[PDB]
RNA sequence: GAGCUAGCCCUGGCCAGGGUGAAGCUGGGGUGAGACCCAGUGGAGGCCCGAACCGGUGGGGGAUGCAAACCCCUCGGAUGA
RNA sequence: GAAUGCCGGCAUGAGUAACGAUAAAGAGGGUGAGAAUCCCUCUCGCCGUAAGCCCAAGGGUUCCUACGCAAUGGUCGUCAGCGUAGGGUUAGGCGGGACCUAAGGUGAAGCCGAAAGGCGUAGCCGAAGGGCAGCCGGUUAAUAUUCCGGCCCUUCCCGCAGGUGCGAUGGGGGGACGCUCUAGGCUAGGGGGACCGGAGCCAUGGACGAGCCCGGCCAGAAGCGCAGGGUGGGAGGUAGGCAAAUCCGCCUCCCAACAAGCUCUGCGUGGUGGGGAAGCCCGGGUGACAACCCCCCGAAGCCAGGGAGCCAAGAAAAGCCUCUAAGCACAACCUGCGGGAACCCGUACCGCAAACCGACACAGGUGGGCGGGUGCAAGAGCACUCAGGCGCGCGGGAGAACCCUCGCCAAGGAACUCUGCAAGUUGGCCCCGUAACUUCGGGAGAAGGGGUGCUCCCUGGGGUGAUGAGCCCCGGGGAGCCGCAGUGAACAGGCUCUGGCGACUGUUUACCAAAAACACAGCUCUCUGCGAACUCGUAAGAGGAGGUAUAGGGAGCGACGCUUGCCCGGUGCCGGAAGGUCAAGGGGAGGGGUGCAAGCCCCGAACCGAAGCCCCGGUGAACGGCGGCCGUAACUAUAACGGUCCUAAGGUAGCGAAAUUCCUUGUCGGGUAAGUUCCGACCUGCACGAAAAGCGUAACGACCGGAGCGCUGUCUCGGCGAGGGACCCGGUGAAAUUGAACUGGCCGUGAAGAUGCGGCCUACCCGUGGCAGGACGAAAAGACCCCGUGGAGCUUUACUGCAGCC
RNA sequence: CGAUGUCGGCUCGUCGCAUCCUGGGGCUGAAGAAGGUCCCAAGGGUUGGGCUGUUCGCCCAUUAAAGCGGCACGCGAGCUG
RNA sequence: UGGGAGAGGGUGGUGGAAUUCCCGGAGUAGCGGUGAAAUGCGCAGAUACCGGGAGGAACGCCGAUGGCGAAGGCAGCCACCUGGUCCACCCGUGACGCUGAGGCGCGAAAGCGUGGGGAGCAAACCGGAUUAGAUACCCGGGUAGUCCACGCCCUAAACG
RNA sequence: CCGAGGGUAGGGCCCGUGACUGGGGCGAAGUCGUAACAAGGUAGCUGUACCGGAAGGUGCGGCUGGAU
RNA sequence: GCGGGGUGGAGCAGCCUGGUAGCUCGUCGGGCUCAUAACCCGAAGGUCGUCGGUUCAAAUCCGGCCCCCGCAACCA
């Protein structure tokens, strides 16, 4: 449950930070540990490829398990919950009885101290990562493979879940964060529950400054620059859109599709997405 | 005020040094023309 | 050609002194339990005044200058984007 | 002979401006041919969080000594960062290398590209980050953690002794980390002493004093003491750390448990080695056998990898420790001890500056450390001062205008002016006191007001120490004295009422614009299912992201509050397996050429044939658009209401002479003696209006309006004073400009504004200080404007291509 | 057009007279006072404020009066902006 | 103490009918709607029918004139937790009571804030009709809302 | 010392008044519709919401003070 | 300056492309009603802004004058 201030700063009036309260250890494994370079934005040619990035918190990139059929049938106990600040959700530490350690995805309802486990036998019970295809029909489900054995790519932002809607031959089918429904390998691993710390798009970044500390630098609309710059730019005192709504790069950016047309993904994209 | 020319003996022999001007087809021209041209230093002089 | 400048990356460094007094915590009151109230404690903040530092608002001077952007007075930020 | 021609030389302005911070000078003695300028002394002034000192970069001999003075030095010059010559930089321990990684760079494997080349895991390179062993003094003209003296320490080689399953580029541990706040104990540094040492002093009225002046330390191995850091011990099992592993991780068990122990640092002491003032007498010597003690203040530095809180969640690798594998255990490693060995480069000097970046010995710029004392509430602020460094490389006079910087001004008090522009006022502290409004934080230092020095008396709490004295830190009460005045100097808000715009702190046109512009949290639309979209690239490859729809791209709007109406006919976009059109290709009715002929060859209808477009729907926080005429109420006026034409639909709420209103200083009200501005209304809104958002809004603003109080040289209206120039004399000595000049007024004339023509009037020759009307004055081959079938940036439903996408 | 800086203010004036005032006049539907109208006259004078960039104008309060024009809409190598 | 009846309340779970959409089939010239129509939908294959899937909301018969609660109000079924109440016995305390300005709490619908959810329904709005007009009643659509959670609002022909 | 009062600054309350603006009351024969009383020709009233020249309309829930 | 308009009483067609004036309302008479509105059945009313030309013929085509809307009026 998100964490209000007393307006004694004009930002301080609206900035809220997340309470951490499910969070038990302060400090990283640093067996788990790796240094995380920070880009900027700039790609190996040195180019900003993506504007706006950089000046942000210097962070370690704790290293998740997205695979977790690694180690079938060892059970594993809860360390404790951290902080990852190179996603949105939690992590969670696991102690293999193997005498393993490895961050997973913290998902909600999941308490320190129990002992999950992956794999085709497992229960069905939060934080268990079994083979799609084993997990019964209508429960809601995360971290899912989208090709077998290639990891785990969706659902994995705080909030987020994905329900088993049914199954056709090799195939289940997964109604995805966005609405889109998905036929899925039965094969593909998932994680049953929903990721954790649901409250986090109810934070309040509150001022400027927040923004930058998360690496986000200030971002300038076209309207606001020059016809060498951008379609919207030019005019004298300010202006309408003046022709259609576009980008730096001139494509359109209401309404334009443009997923590529002969992807064979298509082929098991059920039904595109909705609100 | 700070002026253009803020000298460093690291940049100048990093940008304009020799082996700068070997590593490059463009930099390699450099000094075939200079050396056509009869110049006594194919390079900036610095003090390492 | 990025030894000026602009952005970013890596790694270091710097910010006198004073002011205000958030959450929390303690104690008390309150109540079925609470909410909450008070005092103490606490020391938060693109908080306040103000040097260094970063600036460049107003005026004057300068104008073959001390200077191809300087000087004086004044003024803005000064734990933060 | 002219090209604002090119080169060179020499003029003109002109003995003119200037000679570079207004920190400031004077005399005496020396030296030399020559002295304001060099040396010495005494006096004066200036910096002192520097204008002193030590590093780094950059500079590259500028260092020291001798001898020089042509040039350099804005004057001089005997001097010098100048010329000549000689000398000067010494390290296992300081810095860097023979160590380690960071971004980045390079790059066997590999991938890509017409060539050149671009990528790329490892590895390698890469530092002001990690890691690693020297501290105090003396010494030279010039080097010193480098030479020397003292007391310490490191690595490598080998030997000896003891110990041990030894052994690594391989596994594990460690290294290893943020921000703010901060405990204890120290140290750096400082204040004081009636105590210790000291040459000396008694002045001019007094003082022979518990007087004055000056000093009262630094380094140090083991050990010891103090304060901290780090750290469980043992056993059993084990499938994990890509082989093994007794290591590590996991599990069970026992003991230990704020401890202690072991270990590592800091500090203190510590054998011992140094230092040692004023004053005097020539850098020295004496002082002196110097003394080297007590007390208080005390770090931001040390213990340190300390603690707490917070969210934005805070490098890597080696050294190091441990585990084992090959192998090897005649080895090897560990510990102690000894001897031997220990290379390369830097070291001078300036270093907030006359030696660096600025063409200059240039009022500019330049990162780190030290930065003393007293008082002012604190402090790196301010004033004055220590150590130390300086008086700024032209001077002497004079005492006009005028200019700059500065001081005061009778009466008035903004009447000045576009504007209180500027300059006043206010000004720190402590106390009393403080409004609308509000988002309850704020508005607030609101506003306004009192106090503030010194002396004596009584007294409360605190740190130290001991619980006491002493020192030190906070106070409280009482009685008094002095002046015009007690933050007596310096540094240090003027305030209020009321609009516009923007929520706010932020950002911007380096060098005429800081703002109402950009950004901004927040709101919405939209794309994107991950080999994501999007971006950069021919590509490989990268960014996105080691992220996954609570995410990422794009777009508008811009805290918050209350809200955001109608129009989908046109354009964009989304949907639409019918139809229509539709290229290459398919197909081949039927034509043509040629050949004796089989043949060879050419054209070619129907029909099948994608996207796009056509067509059918949707869609506004998509591009956008949101009427006209005529009539009508029992005074008049106006129209709730009605008639009709047109549209895709006819502007909703809210606002309105507005950053928008043309007519316009609209009209009415307020404010004023008077108000083209201001505020408040009205509504015929030339030409508001709802995310190019609409109406509000506390707080905020070097933004832009209006008004008042305070107070002023802004003003009536000017006067006087200060210093730096201007002026005079000695030194040095420019500049733009310049057809030549023997260069007057008027009224005419003239290419229409004449020193230069005509007529007339005036006028002896040449300077100096001043003023700026003319020389269509100087500067700049007009930016305005036109012209050129000149150029460039930008646009789009101009043309034609291309990437890209389909 | 190988540059003649452009409104307004300020400062400094100077000229014209088609005279705002003061002086001298005729005519008056001039009783007086005070006006009207025209002639002569350029010696001197011709205020301070509110509003606006303003010139102009309107307004306040006075005046003998609150004149009109020229001088590159006088005067930016004099200032302002 | 032993008993009983009940949609009293809260949480979690869950059943079937129906509506809408989507998919497949089969099938064709209309469907829909009204007072009568038109808008609308349908040869780009609708309506009607069978099978499949997705989702939301309300719970038919039981249901009654019934029951429960202080009121607002509560209706499929299952389990947990919790209030009230009536009856019996005649067992314990011994007037410990009634009321209640204030205070505090609950409080239908609509409405507000932040998330979610969205089948049917439907203010607003659009269209078709009617009409002198029709900013209505009727018809085709249709956004909030209706639904969940949390926090507000505190109203009523909150009535017997 | 206190002290009538005078003065300076800032508050609170009341009253009078004000361009314009809000609805209200009343006013013999104004304009527009017909909302309610009959099932008032869509039962009405109601709280709330939104909307419209106006009465009103509509949604959501409620009351009978509704008819047959 | 450039564009559009002017026609029964009101608002609109006809103009282009000559021969013809048409739609809604209103107005007049009749009907239904106790009466009015609405509704129903009939009717009248326009020499086309004005003048001048072209034509056999002009609302129409071309000039002039009049009025009435709309747009423009910029560079210093
Ligand atoms: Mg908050
Ligand atoms: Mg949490
Ligand atoms: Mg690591
Ligand atoms: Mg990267
Ligand atoms: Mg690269
Ligand atoms: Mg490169
Ligand atoms: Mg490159
Ligand atoms: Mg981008
Ligand atoms: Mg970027
Ligand atoms: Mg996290
Ligand atoms: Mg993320
Ligand atoms: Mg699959
Ligand atoms: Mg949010
Ligand atoms: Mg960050
Ligand atoms: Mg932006
Ligand atoms: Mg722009
Ligand atoms: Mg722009
Ligand atoms: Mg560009
Ligand atoms: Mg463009
Ligand atoms: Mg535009
Ligand atoms: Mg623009
Ligand atoms: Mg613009
Ligand atoms: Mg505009
Ligand atoms: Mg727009
Ligand atoms: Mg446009
Ligand atoms: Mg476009
Ligand atoms: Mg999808
Ligand atoms: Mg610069
Ligand atoms: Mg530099
Ligand atoms: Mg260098
Ligand atoms: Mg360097
Ligand atoms: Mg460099
Ligand atoms: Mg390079
Ligand atoms: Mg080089
Ligand atoms: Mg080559
Ligand atoms: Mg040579
Ligand atoms: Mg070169
Ligand atoms: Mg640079
Ligand atoms: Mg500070
Ligand atoms: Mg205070
Ligand atoms: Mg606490
Ligand atoms: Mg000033
Ligand atoms: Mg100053
Ligand atoms: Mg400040
Ligand atoms: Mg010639
Ligand atoms: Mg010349
Ligand atoms: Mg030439
Ligand atoms: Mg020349
Ligand atoms: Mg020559
Ligand atoms: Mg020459
Ligand atoms: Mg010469
Ligand atoms: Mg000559
Ligand atoms: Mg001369
Ligand atoms: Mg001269
Ligand atoms: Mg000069
Ligand atoms: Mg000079
Ligand atoms: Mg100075
Ligand atoms: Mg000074
Ligand atoms: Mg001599
Ligand atoms: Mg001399
Ligand atoms: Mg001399
Ligand atoms: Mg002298
Ligand atoms: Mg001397
Ligand atoms: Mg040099
Ligand atoms: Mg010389
Ligand atoms: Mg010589
Ligand atoms: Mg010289
Ligand atoms: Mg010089
Ligand atoms: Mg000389
Ligand atoms: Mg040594
Ligand atoms: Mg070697
Ligand atoms: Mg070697
Ligand atoms: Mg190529
Ligand atoms: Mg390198
Ligand atoms: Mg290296
Ligand atoms: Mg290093
Ligand atoms: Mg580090
Ligand atoms: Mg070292
Ligand atoms: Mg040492
Ligand atoms: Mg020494
Ligand atoms: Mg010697
Ligand atoms: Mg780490
Ligand atoms: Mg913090
Ligand atoms: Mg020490
Ligand atoms: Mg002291
Ligand atoms: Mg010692
Ligand atoms: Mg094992
Ligand atoms: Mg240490
Ligand atoms: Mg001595
Ligand atoms: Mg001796
Ligand atoms: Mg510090
Ligand atoms: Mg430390
Ligand atoms: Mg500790
Ligand atoms: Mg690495
Ligand atoms: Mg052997
Ligand atoms: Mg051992
Ligand atoms: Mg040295
Ligand atoms: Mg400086
Ligand atoms: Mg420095
Ligand atoms: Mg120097
Ligand atoms: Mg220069
Ligand atoms: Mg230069
Ligand atoms: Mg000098
Ligand atoms: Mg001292
Ligand atoms: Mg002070
Ligand atoms: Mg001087
Ligand atoms: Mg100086
Ligand atoms: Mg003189
Ligand atoms: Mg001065
Ligand atoms: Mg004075
Ligand atoms: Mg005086
Ligand atoms: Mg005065
Ligand atoms: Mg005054
Ligand atoms: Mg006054
Ligand atoms: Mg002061
Ligand atoms: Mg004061
Ligand atoms: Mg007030
Ligand atoms: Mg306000
Ligand atoms: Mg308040
Ligand atoms: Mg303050
Ligand atoms: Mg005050
Ligand atoms: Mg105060
Ligand atoms: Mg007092
Ligand atoms: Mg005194
Ligand atoms: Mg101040
Ligand atoms: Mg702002
Ligand atoms: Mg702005
Ligand atoms: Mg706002
Ligand atoms: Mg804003
Ligand atoms: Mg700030
Ligand atoms: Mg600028
Ligand atoms: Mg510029
Ligand atoms: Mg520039
Ligand atoms: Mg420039
Ligand atoms: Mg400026
Ligand atoms: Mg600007
Ligand atoms: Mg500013
Ligand atoms: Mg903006
Ligand atoms: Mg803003
Ligand atoms: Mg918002
Ligand atoms: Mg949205
Ligand atoms: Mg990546
Ligand atoms: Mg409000
Ligand atoms: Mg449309
Ligand atoms: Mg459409
Ligand atoms: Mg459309
Ligand atoms: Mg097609
Ligand atoms: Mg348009
Ligand atoms: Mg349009
Ligand atoms: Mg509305
Ligand atoms: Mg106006
Ligand atoms: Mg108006
Ligand atoms: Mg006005
Ligand atoms: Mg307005
Ligand atoms: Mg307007
Ligand atoms: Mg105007
Ligand atoms: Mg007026
Ligand atoms: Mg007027
Ligand atoms: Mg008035
Ligand atoms: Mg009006
Ligand atoms: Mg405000
Ligand atoms: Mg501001
Ligand atoms: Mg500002
Ligand atoms: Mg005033
Ligand atoms: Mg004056
Ligand atoms: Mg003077
Ligand atoms: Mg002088
Ligand atoms: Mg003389
Ligand atoms: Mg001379
Ligand atoms: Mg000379
Ligand atoms: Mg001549
Ligand atoms: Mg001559
Ligand atoms: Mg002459
Ligand atoms: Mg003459
Ligand atoms: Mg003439
Ligand atoms: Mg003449
Ligand atoms: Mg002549
Ligand atoms: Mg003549
Ligand atoms: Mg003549
Ligand atoms: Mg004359
Ligand atoms: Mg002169
Ligand atoms: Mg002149
Ligand atoms: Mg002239
Ligand atoms: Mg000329
Ligand atoms: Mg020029
Ligand atoms: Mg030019
Ligand atoms: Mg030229
Ligand atoms: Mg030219
Ligand atoms: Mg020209
Ligand atoms: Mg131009
Ligand atoms: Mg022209
Ligand atoms: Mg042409
Ligand atoms: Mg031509
Ligand atoms: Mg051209
Ligand atoms: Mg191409
Ligand atoms: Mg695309
Ligand atoms: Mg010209
Ligand atoms: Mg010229
Ligand atoms: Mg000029
Ligand atoms: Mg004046
Ligand atoms: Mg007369
Ligand atoms: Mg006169
Ligand atoms: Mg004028
Ligand atoms: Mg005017
Ligand atoms: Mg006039
Ligand atoms: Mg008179
Ligand atoms: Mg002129
Ligand atoms: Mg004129
Ligand atoms: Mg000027
Ligand atoms: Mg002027
Ligand atoms: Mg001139
Ligand atoms: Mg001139
Ligand atoms: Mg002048
Ligand atoms: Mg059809
Ligand atoms: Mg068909
Ligand atoms: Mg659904
Ligand atoms: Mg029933
Ligand atoms: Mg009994
Ligand atoms: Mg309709
Ligand atoms: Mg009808
Ligand atoms: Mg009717
Ligand atoms: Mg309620
Ligand atoms: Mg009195
Ligand atoms: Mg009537
Ligand atoms: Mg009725
Ligand atoms: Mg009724
Ligand atoms: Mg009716
Ligand atoms: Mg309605
Ligand atoms: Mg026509
Ligand atoms: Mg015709
Ligand atoms: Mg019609
Ligand atoms: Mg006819
Ligand atoms: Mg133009």
Not at chain 1, 132 to 139: A, H, M, N
Request: glycine share 12%; net charge positive; aromatic share 6%.
């Amino acid at each position: 449950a998100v964490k209000k201030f007393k307006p004694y700063t004009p930002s301080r009036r609206f900035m809220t930070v997340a309470d951490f309260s499910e969070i038990t250890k302060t400090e990283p494994e640093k067996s788990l540990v790796k240094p995380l370079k920070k880009t900027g934005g700039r790609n190996n040619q040195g180019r900003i490829t993506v504007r706006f990035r950089g000046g942000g918190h210097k962070r370690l990139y704790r290293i998740i398990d997205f695979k977790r059929w690694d180690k079938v049938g060892i059970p594993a106990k809860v360390a404790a919950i951290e902080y990852d600040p190179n996603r949105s959700a939690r992590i969670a530490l696991l102690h293999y009885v193997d005498g393993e350690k490895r961050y997973i995805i913290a998902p909600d309802g999941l308490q320190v101290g129990q002992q999950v486990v992956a794999g085709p036998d497992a229960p069905i019970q939060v934080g268990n990562a079994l083979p799609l295809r084993f997990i019964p029909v209508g429960t809601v489900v995360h971290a899912v493979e989208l090709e077998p054995k290639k990891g785990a790519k969706l659902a994995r932002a705080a909030g987020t879940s994905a329900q088993i809607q049914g199954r056709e031959g090799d195939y289940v089918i997964l109604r995805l964060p966005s609405g889109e429904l998905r036929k899925v390998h039965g094969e593909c691993y998932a994680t049953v529950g929903a990721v954790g710390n649901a409250d986090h798009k109810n934070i309040v970044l509150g001022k400027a400054g927040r923004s930058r500390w998360l690496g986000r630098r200030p971002h300038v609309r076209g309207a606001a620059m020059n016809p060498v710059d951008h379609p919207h730019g030019g005019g004298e005192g300010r202006a309408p859109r003046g022709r259609p709504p576009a980008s730096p790069w001139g494509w359109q950016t209401k309404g334009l599709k443009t997923r590529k047309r002969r992807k064979p993904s298509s082929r098991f994209i059920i039904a595109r997405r909705k609100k | 005020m700070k002026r253009t020319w803020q000298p460093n003996r690291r940049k100048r022999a990093k940008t304009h040094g020799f082996r700068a001007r070997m590593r490059t087809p463009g930099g390699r021209k450099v000094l075939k023309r200079r050396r056509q041209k009869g110049r006594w230093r194919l390079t900036p002089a610095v003090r390492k």
